[PDB]
Amino acid sequence: GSSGSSGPNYRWTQTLAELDLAVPFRVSFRLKGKDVVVDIQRRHLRVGLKGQPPVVDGELYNEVKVEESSWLIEDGKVVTVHLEKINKMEWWNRLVTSDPEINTKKINPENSKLSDLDSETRSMVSGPSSG
């Protein structure tokens, strides 16, 4: 990261061992481990929200122990992924060898509004049988 032109989309790092990925989302609820999308592959990290576009999608810089992978939802919105190197002794110069697609907009999206709204919800849905 940090080149001059264009910017990233999601935050990520590492520690000459394990990797760390984070993808914030503009939601109004606490995303659960169901409406999320995390395809931690050996040499490919695909992240995103179910139904939504995968913020991450490309061949990792190198194989990574997927079996020892993990991910969670921070602030019930941000999707964090935990990648593990196979050697755990190599510095990566890039998250993926081939970027996904878009790179979203600049860091800050837009904070030119004034918190002043109101709207909730409440209801149920049962699933009957047939035959």
Coordinates of C-alpha atoms in Angstrom, one line a residue, residues 16 79 112 130:
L16 CA 6.1 -12.2 9.4
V79 CA -15.5 -8.3 8.6
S112 CA -21.5 15.8 5.6
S130 CA -46.7 -28.7 2.7

